[PDB]
Design a protein around this nucleic acid. Structure first.
Ligand SMILES: [Zn+2]
Length: 74
DNA sequence: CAAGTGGCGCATAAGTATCAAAATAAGCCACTTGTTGTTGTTCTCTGGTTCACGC
């Protein structure tokens, strides 16, 4: 569905990345986001800078993202 | 001025849940070498050297 489609698009370089999310927590220290082709941030998705995995982002809660393996010992 | 509060959400998070696809041990049986156990047999040891002793 959308997950594999956006993974392919970001792998091919259609969308750029913005490694800065302007956040207080350490979750965004090693996490990035996806920008649309018109320099607009996408909704509900996050990108990682070490293992390069796209995950669903929820505005209501971010506890699940803390369980990501790349953030094990950070 | 400055020590005291709400507020605007607010970006965070220690909690909870259920939906999958895997990582494991349990009870049994195969079966082949090597390996341990009673329960028999078979050959010596002690029968004994001279003194009390009366017959
Ligand atoms: Zn990661």
């Amino acid at each position: 569905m959308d997950n594999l489609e956006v993974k392919a698009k970001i792998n091919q370089g259609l969308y750029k990345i913005t490694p800065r999310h302007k956040g207080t927590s350490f979750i965004w220290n090693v996490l990035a986001d996806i920008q649309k082709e018109d320099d607009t941030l996408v909704e509900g998705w996050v990108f990682c800078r070490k293992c390069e995995k796209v995950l669903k982002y929820t505005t209501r809660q971010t506890s699940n993202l803390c369980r990501h393996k790349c953030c094990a010992s950070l």
